[PDB]
Design a protein around this ligand. Sequence first.
Ligand SMILES: C[C@@H](OCC1CCCCC1)[C@H](NC(=O)[C@@H]1CN(C(=O)c2cncs2)CC12CN(C(=O)[C@H]1CC1(C)C)C2)C(=O)N1CCOCC1
Lengths: 297, 270
Amino acid sequence: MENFQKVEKIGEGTYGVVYKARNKLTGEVVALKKIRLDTETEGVPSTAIREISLLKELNHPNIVKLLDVIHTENKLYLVFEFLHQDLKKFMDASALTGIPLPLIKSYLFQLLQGLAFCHSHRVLHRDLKPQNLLINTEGAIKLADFGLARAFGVPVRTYTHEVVTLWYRAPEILLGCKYYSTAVDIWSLGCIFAEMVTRRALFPGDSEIDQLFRIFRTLGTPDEVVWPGVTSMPDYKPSFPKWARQDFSKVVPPLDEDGRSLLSQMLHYDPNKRISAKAALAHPFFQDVTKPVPHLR
Amino acid sequence: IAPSRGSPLPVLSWANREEVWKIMLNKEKTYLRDQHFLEQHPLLQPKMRAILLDWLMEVCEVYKLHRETFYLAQDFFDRYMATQENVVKTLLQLIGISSLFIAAKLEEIYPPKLHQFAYVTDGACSGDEILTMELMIMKALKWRLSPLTIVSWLNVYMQVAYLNYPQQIFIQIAELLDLCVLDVDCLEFPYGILAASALYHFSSSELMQKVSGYQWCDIENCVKWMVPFAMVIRETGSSKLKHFRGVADEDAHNIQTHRDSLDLLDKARA
Ligand SMILES: C[C@@H](OCC1CCCCC1)[C@H](NC(=O)[C@@H]1CN(C(=O)c2cncs2)CC12CN(C(=O)[C@H]1CC1(C)C)C2)C(=O)N1CCOCC1
């Protein structure tokens, strides 16, 4: 770690501080995560081990790269590639002018490519929020912060005492589903797609029930017809107020019919019918950015 | 590296079956095995590994750890030793327990605490030593801690069958794999082949090929090697699916169990 010069503190988590650092001889910039092993009762934190291993397996242009892992004395350094801004700061900086629709489309397409790759590796991210999406100055966006990611070779269960996002939490989780699915990541991306378009969080709840009602007021109170089984879920109440699904022309005015089509499929109540990441890439909203390949068989 | 292997995965809504299968196949190309690694440690003998692995299995049951945690520890141990030289018997317990510690931290939601890992060593390993060894193992493995274990392959195969009492069949095949893994010669065979051969011994070539994609020719040699082991298991009757307090019935098949398999291993090798 002697060839790195710390330049600025850019973050802090339960397990360490994150610094922007420069390689003195090459001039390259990296993001350093410093874990002080002296204060760790259980050795390398389980979340750090899992993230290091996952990132070594997940190499993709839309997934933040882990460049190295350096064990100095008493300290474990995670060396990540550096990106100048997260999507939250970019959207806030663009609240007045708005983000050009072609950049919105390109960002969402890239997010879906990185997500499809994660899902192909049988890994749920579970924490896709604008703060965990990083952008560079070349028009690229990548998925980051895999601390909450879990592999689903076997069902991933929901735990009452786990801290996960609320504004980007899927309704099946809020209604007490026993397991997570790839759909929760698609839901998060749908909220983010709408936030990029309107520059306001789509569902900014302040409690679990507030978050749920906010979703209901926008997409309508679900019933057995739109989501088979809702009435049987643990936290479902027949007492839930009946709200009508709002028209997407008012929810996301700047979006065209193709964009509104994709968002509705990414926000489908039924986790079983919510669009997959690979399917979203095939949606007509992205016909100008991609063209299929000839299929064999 | 099996040109005759087909893809048994059903159509998946969440991803492209071809890419999912390809990633699974590529794991066997990143995570190597060396059935002769003990030749790098002349003072070690194969029985020592069997004893160590059987003990870790019993540790896993006591704390009700998952089968995947045990197989992650077995793969970590075998891969780590392949990178080392001249290790002696008195260090195996620490290497093994630290391998389980890493595994439990990766796989369990609420892993046992470090002091519990030291506790089961009964004064032989301290917590500071486990902390030291875990870092040694992880760095020597270049932090590649995500293999497709033998038992994870069983879950893939049994999931292909279900999506086309499954829990009791799983633990019975798992019991046979638990016995085979104690013999270092099982590493001659890809983890996927071992799982398919154990499943074949409790089923048919037709089901094996349908759920694993392997043709008979790819598993025949493993099948022949596994013969003595399948036979000592069949002769005693297979175990029964057990219940675990605090573990949902739907996940009970994934909890590691332990029986006196060292006497079975002797009969099989005889
Ligand atoms: C099918 C069941 O296994 C039946 C058991 C197996 C063992 C013996 C008895 C019967 C079930 N598992 C899944 O569905 C896993 C978990 N998945 C998720 O979580 C998802 C999240 N997002 C989207 S799918 C998808 C899944 C990973 N996968 C594949 O890769 C596909 C390509 C394969 C065929 C191999 C399928 C399971 O384990 N259950 C035990 C507890 O409750 C009952 C069910």
